[PDB]
Write a protein that binds this DNA or RNA. Structure first.
Length: 341
RNA sequence: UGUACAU
């Protein structure tokens, strides 16, 4: 049901098509793959009057265009380049529909863009609509990116309804594919009194989390961007378990970020842990230097260890070379010790 | 030689 105008334009029949030569058709073009691209382009170089021409027609049809696979890009354009009046006018069209848009495949894309370009007042009005549906949104493949975007953009003081919805759902959520992403945002952007309760739960479950395909990513975040005190609780939980955890697909990564991001003393106490303590009938370092994952840990110890501790490790390894040569994951550990002596 | 985000 494409107008002859759209058809002809979609078939190279208007190399000089001007913005004003499509008035009456602004929706039609917005829902087309080429039409939508055309509009967006001419819109950058557009005059104030031209841009109003187009706004008149997209405002009229705003919600439809928001949940459209092409229309949404046209709308996002106005949040970026439109005037303050055009932005507030679009955000007003959204009022009432924040949640259904956030769960919508294309709608969430608009929300994310609106959140990034409307004034705090309108941001705060928009976010309020999510209260009551915080976990529905987070566990959703679209919503989760809105929530993520809320945390990045809105005053933290406005996001307490979220922190309150995470109470008792920190672990369950850090083991969620989307949940874990949102936990990271919160840790990055939220206020001290908000991150406290999150970190409380995080610590109570550090053991389970470090071995979880998503959880482990959250612990790594804390070891990379977190407060020293928090780091130490994590490493206090890795300390002693260094051998077992380094042989794990997921947790082996945590152990590297402990070796890497702990204090100078803690770092030295973790490296010594594998050099001393032994494994059943074999030595710890021995087991690790040939394991498919743990071998990476070893190399990461060789790195962050100050020359003193690094000589003892090189020395501790030197005897097992021939065994190392026989195992495939011992190759890159060999590479390192070979460059040494 | 080893793990996660959508038009």
């Amino acid at each position: 049901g494409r107008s002859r105008l759209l058809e002809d334009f979609r078939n190279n029949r208007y190399p000089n098509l001007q913005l004003r030569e499509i008035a009456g058709h602004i929706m039609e073009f917005s829902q087309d793959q080429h039409g939508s691209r055309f509009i967006q382009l001419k819109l950058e170089r557009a005059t104030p009057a031209e841009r109003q021409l187009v706004f008149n027609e997209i405002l009229q049809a705003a919600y439809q265009l928001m949940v459209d696979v092409f229309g949404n890009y046209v709308i996002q354009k106005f949040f970026e380049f439109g005037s303050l009046e055009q932005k507030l006018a679009l955000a007003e069209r959204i009022r009432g529909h924040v949640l259904s848009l956030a769960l919508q495949m294309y709608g969430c894309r608009v929300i994310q863009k609106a959140l990034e370009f409307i004034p705090s007042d309108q941001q705060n009005e928009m976010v309020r609509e999510l209260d009551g549906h915080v976990l529905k949104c987070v566990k959703d493949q679209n919503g989760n990116h809105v929530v993520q975007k809320c945390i990045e953009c809105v005053q933290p003081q406005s996001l307490q309804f979220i922190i309150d919805a995470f109470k008792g759902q920190v672990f369950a959520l850090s083991t969620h594919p989307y949940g874990c992403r949102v936990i990271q945002r919160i840790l990055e952007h939220c206020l001290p009194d908000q991150t406290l309760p999150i970190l409380e739960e995080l610590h109570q479950h550090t053991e389970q989390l470090v071995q979880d395909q998503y959880g482990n990513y959250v612990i790594q975040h804390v070891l990379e961007h977190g407060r020293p005190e928090d780091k130490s609780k994590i490493v206090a939980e890795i300390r002693g378990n260094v051998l077992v955890l380094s042989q794990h697909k997921f947790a082996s990564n945590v152990v590297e970020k402990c070796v890497t991001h702990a204090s100078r003393t803690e770092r030295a106490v973790l490296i010594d842990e594998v050099c001393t303590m032994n494994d059943g009938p074999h030595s710890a370092l021995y087991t690790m230097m040939k394991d498919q994952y743990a071998n990476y840990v070893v190399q990461k110890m060789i790195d962050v260890a100050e020359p003193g501790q690094r000589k003892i490790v090189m020395h501790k390894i030197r005897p097992h070379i021939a065994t190392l040569r026989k195992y495939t994951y011992g190759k890159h550990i060999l590479a390192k010790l070979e460059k040494y002596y």
